[PDB]
Structure formats: structure tokens, C-alpha cells
């Protein structure tokens, strides 16, 4: 069961320019926790759909790759747009833009 996916396995960021002010060590620790739980929640949300394989168009980083490995969920990255569309038409899935 393949999880055809578009958005990368990285922490989100709004398209509009933004500045997240961190003003204390408590805020810095909260940011660290936010990053860690974002990765973990992303991976568990991929897993909870029962997919044995995932495909992302935009690639991702190491802290995601190890999570995909350690949960026995293979996946590929940096798949082109037309390749994503052909995979979707062939395997019968639907392209989703968000976890």
C-alpha cells in the first residue's frame, strides 16, 4: 500500500515571510521539543494509514530517513512531478499535499 505524497518530510514553514522570535531558554527548549515532536508525529501519521511504502516529490533529510528506516516503512524521495502523476495513475492512489 503506497502513500503518494508531495510535501517534504521537513518542518513546515509558511510561504509568507516570517520571524519566530525566541526570547528565553524556555522558548528555545520549546522549539527543540516542537522540532522533535514534529518529526515523530509526521512519521507516526505516515505509519497509521497502514502504508508499506511512501513516495515524496520534494525529498527530505536524515532525521526523517532514520525514522522511515526504523519503522520498517521504505520510501523514495526527489521523485519528479510527472513521475508522481504516473505513479498515482498506475497504482491507483491519490496525491495528497499534506500529512
Amino acid at each position: 500500500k503506497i502513500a503518494i505524497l508531495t510535501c517534504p518530510f521537513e518542518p513546515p514553514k509558511p510561504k509568507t515571510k516570517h520571524k519566530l522570535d525566541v526570547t528565553s531558554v524556555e522558548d528555545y527548549k520549546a522549539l527543540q521539543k516542537y522540532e522533535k515532536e514534529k518529526f515523530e508525529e509526521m512519521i507516526q501519521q505516515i505509519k497509521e494509514t497502514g502504508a508499506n511504502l511512501a513516495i515524496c516529490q520534494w525529498g527530505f533529510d536524515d532525521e526523517a530517513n532514520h525514522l522511515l528506516l526504523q519503522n520498517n516503512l521504505p520510501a523514495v524521495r526527489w521523485v519528479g512531478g510527472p513521475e508522481i502523476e504516473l505513479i498515482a495513475i498506475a497504482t491507483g492512489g491519490r496525491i495528497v499535499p499534506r500529512f
Binding site: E10, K17, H18, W58
Partner: protein
């Protein structure tokens, strides 16, 4: 130097091909004031009106400020649709390499130093797939997406002596490539 401004009134001429009001912009155009004759005054006000009008027109253009936060997923929008005629200076880098850290900090200083050109910075790995580590510091400039200069190399770039010479090397384009090296040669 400001010391020449107080030594003596006799500073007649030395290496000054042209000396008129047409090239005094703002900072010095208002420090003579009483030395600008009277018959040519109306021309001076016409010139200042035109040039302040041009500066006001460029106010709508020169507001970018500092660096921004583009990644691989936003590459195409900000290299093919970033605007008409606006220079974009793509930067490919990774954390850990010192020379590219130097050039990143110098580019960040340039951002506030020159707000007309808004360069964008992106991670090397998650902007182009399978980018080798032999090209850790990468800079290429273009406008409308037509890549002009894409110099590549860790040590051939020379980030130790970058500062002003390669600052204008990136800045000056659309002409002869070798235009500012002779200003600040390494020697």
C-alpha cells in the same frame, strides 16, 4: 578625509576632471549651499527636483532589507517568477564548511549594505538532488532565470579574499565578466 576640509581654504584642484553640482547627490550637495552661485540656481533646483524624484521612484524598488528563508520546494517560484529584471543570487551551501560560512556572513552583510538585489539562500542537499560535496560553496547569479555566471569550487573561489572584490564580482554583471578584480587584487 575630513582633515583636508579644515587645513586651509586653498584646495584649488588636484585630480578633479569635473566639479559641478550635477554629481553631488544628497550628502555633499547640501554642504556647500552658499557656494552655488545665484545665476545657475534655478538649474540647481531643477536638477535636485529631478534627482530626488528619481530617488523617490527607486524607493519602490530598493526595499528588501536582509536575507530570506527559501528552500528547495520554493526554488522554481523565486527563480522563474521572482520578478522582471530583479537580480537573484542563488546560494547553495551546507552547515560545517567554513569558507561557505564566511561567504554566507559576507552575503548577509551585503543584504543590508545593498537592498536593491535580494539574493536567496538554499540548502545544497535539499535544493538539487545528488549534489556532490565537492561543490559545497556554490553561488550563481541571474535575472529572469537565465543563469549567467555559475562559478564552482571550494578553493578556487577564494573566500578568504572575497570581501569587496568578489562582492562586486557577484554584483556587477550583464557585461564584461572581468570588471572588478583589478580594484582589489590579491597580489
Amino acid at each position: 578625509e575630513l582633515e583636508e576640509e579644515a587645513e586651509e581654504e586653498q584646495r584649488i584642484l588636484q585630480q578633479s576632471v569635473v566639479k559641478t553640482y550635477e554629481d553631488m547627490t544628497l550628502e555633499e550637495l547640501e554642504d556647500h549651499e552658499d557656494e552655488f552661485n545665484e545665476e545657475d540656481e534655478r538649474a540647481i533646483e531643477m536638477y535636485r527636483r529631478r534627482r530626488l524624484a528619481e530617488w523617490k521612484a527607486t524607493k519602490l524598488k530598493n526595499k528588501f532589507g536582509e536575507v530570506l528563508e527559501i528552500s528547495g520546494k520554493d526554488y522554481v517560484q523565486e527563480v522563474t517568477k521572482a520578478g522582471e529584471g530583479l537580480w537573484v543570487i542563488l546560494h547553495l551551501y551546507k552547515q560545517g564548511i567554513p569558507l561557505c560560512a564566511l561567504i554566507n556572513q559576507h552575503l548577509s552583510g551585503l543584504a543590508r549594505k545593498f537592498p536593491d538585489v535580494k539574493f536567496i539562500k538554499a540548502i545544497s542537499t535539499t535544493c538539487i538532488p545528488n549534489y556532490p560535496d565537492r561543490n559545497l560553496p556554490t553561488i550563481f547569479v541571474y535575472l529572469e532565470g537565465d543563469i549567467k555566471a555559475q562559478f564552482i569550487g571550494p578553493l578556487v573561489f577564494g573566500g578568504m579574499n572575497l570581501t569587496r572584490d568578489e562582492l562586486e564580482w557577484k554584483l556587477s554583471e550583464s557585461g564584461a565578466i572581468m570588471t572588478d578584480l583589478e580594484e582589489n587584487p590579491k597580489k
